[PDB]
């Protein structure tokens, strides 16, 4: 059960650090910069629509995933 201790601690720490509102702003800035350096000329619209619309969706599904540390640790064969 020793690997489970560190696995649950790590995943709860990730959920806590991602709980900050500034984390969402940093993620949005990183997403904008991702298509800012890309050679595709249509990447700006792609980000400005898809990312701006669906980033809170991934943020909240990560919320739902972090509420079950046992499940995510089991998915990595670190727990039951």
């Amino acid at each position: 059960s020793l690997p489970c201790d560190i696995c649950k601690d790590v995943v709860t720490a990730a959920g806590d650090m991602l709980k900050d509102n500034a984390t969402e702003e940093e993620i949005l800035v990183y997403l904008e910069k991702t298509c800012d350096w890309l050679p595709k000329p249509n990447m700006s619209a792609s980000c400005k629509e898809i990312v701006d619309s669906y980033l809170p969706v991934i943020l909240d599904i990560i919320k739902g995933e972090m509420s079950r540390p046992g499940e995510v640790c089991s998915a990595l064969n670190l727990c039951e």
Binding site: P3, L76, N77, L78
Partner: protein, 191 residues
Amino acid sequence: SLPFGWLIVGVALLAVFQSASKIITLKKRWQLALSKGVHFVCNLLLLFVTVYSHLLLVAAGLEAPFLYLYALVYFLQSINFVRIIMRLWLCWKCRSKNPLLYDANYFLCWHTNCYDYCIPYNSVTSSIVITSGDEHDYQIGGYTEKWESGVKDCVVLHSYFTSDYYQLYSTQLSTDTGVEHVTFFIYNKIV
């Protein structure tokens, strides 16, 4: 003061070992051992190359845009190391090196005075069939182990965490099935 040729030679060695690893068959025992050794050398080369590239990015002050990425490379590798740590320990649980050689999810072990049988198995099923015969040998799902001692009434399927005990109910000799020189042992899971 770090020679860049090291990065290129490490990349070449890593590519060589990855290319060789995926073409080695897993039929014989020496083939499995060679594949595991090649995978270990590849993992060592991957760690060396990642560390060196981290030491070249930091030497040129270019580690800032990639630092997070490298953290991931470490974190997953940490899990990998931890995974290896279970496998070795799993070996000690069955006193066989088969968990190192095989990547199976579970291992059906049973111990005798002579030998410690450990045969790979995919999942926890409600029943397990062991086929003994043809020098004779045991096998399950095509995985073959050499016949050294008899058979036990209580075998155990080991994962790292779970341990499911199976009890022998019925034995099928070569009189009730017609398959000559072959015996079937049927085990049921114990609740």
